[PDB]
Amino acid sequence: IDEIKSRGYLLVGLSADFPPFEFVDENGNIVGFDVDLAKEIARRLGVELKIVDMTFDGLIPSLLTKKIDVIISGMTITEERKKVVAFSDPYFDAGQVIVVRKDSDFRPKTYEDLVGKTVAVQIGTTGDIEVSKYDGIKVVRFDKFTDAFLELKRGRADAVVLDSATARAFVAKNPDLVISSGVLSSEQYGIAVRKEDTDLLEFINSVLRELKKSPYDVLIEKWFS
């Protein structure tokens, strides 16, 4: 925390291929729900925000090597990831969906409906992790969701598997695609920090709980707590 203030910025790592959380706008800028969160934390620390955009699967390792301060990148909290990083309070709820081409009679509803099919995923995601559990699925793994979608649009893969909110945003810009399934999991997004940075995490959870407090709730707290 003191070190972040010396440096004069909070260094946040994300992969900007995940609207509406992180993504590239028409002018070339990284924007989204997570970008806003990150600005808030920075401002509340009295420092500037510095964003680095990288491969999603590389986020944890570069947190662990001190190349970034924190991960804000639509990252699902998982028992597995908890082995190596710490998570803030949850800040969003989503789950996996299956995206396919519109001009197709293909409409899978379950993971099992993908046995025999070629499914595109972002490497290291919970999408990746679930489909990897079924041996019948030909899993095709990409760094960026941008390429997973090109692969589906051209018909070389039969589906993309990815988080519901982001699936909706990609389908809105790609009328050739449709979400064929219901939500297949219960996932929550968290902000990741190194386990040793316990002050940073406390502060971040505290920014998170304030955000969810109306000025009414804050006023109640003032007089009743």
Ligand X SMILES: NC(=[NH2+])NCCC[C@H](N)C(=O)O
Least CB distance from residue 205 to ligand X, whole Å?
19
Decide which of its own copies, ligand X, none touches 220; Cβ closer than 5 to 8 Å per partner kind: its own copies
Decide which of ligand X, its own copies, none touches 22; Cβ closer than 5 to 8 Å per partner kind: ligand X
Among residues 50, 54, 57, the alpha carbon closest in space to that of 35 is found at 50
Decide which of ligand X, its own copies, none touches 58; Cβ closer than 5 to 8 Å per partner kind: none
Instruction: Show contacts with its own copies in window 165-184 (CB under 8 A).
Output: 165
Decide which of ligand X, its own copies, none touches 219; Cβ closer than 5 to 8 Å per partner kind: its own copies
Q: Are 100 and 180 in contact (CB under 8 A)?
A: yes
Q: Are 68 and 62 in contact (CB under 8 A)?
A: yes
Q: How far apart are CA 151 and CA 171, in angstroms?
A: 14
Q: Does 56 help bind ligand X (rule: CB under 6 A)?
A: yes
DSSP character string of 8-44? TEEEEEE-S-BTTTBEE-TTS-EESHHHHHHHHHHHH
Q: Which long-range contacts (CB under 8 A, 24 or more apart) does 209-214 make?
A: 209/89, 211/37, 211/40
Q: Does 125 help bind ligand X (rule: CB under 6 A)?
A: yes
**Which one among 17, 69, 151, 197 touches ligand X, defined by CB under 6 A?**
17
Least CB distance from residue 83 to its own copies, whole Å?
29
Q: Does 215 help bind its own copies (rule: CB under 8 A)?
A: yes
Stretch that binds its own copies, among 29-37, 46-54, 112-120, 133-141 (CB under 8 A): 29-37
Q: How far apart are CA 151 and CA 76, in angstroms?
A: 24
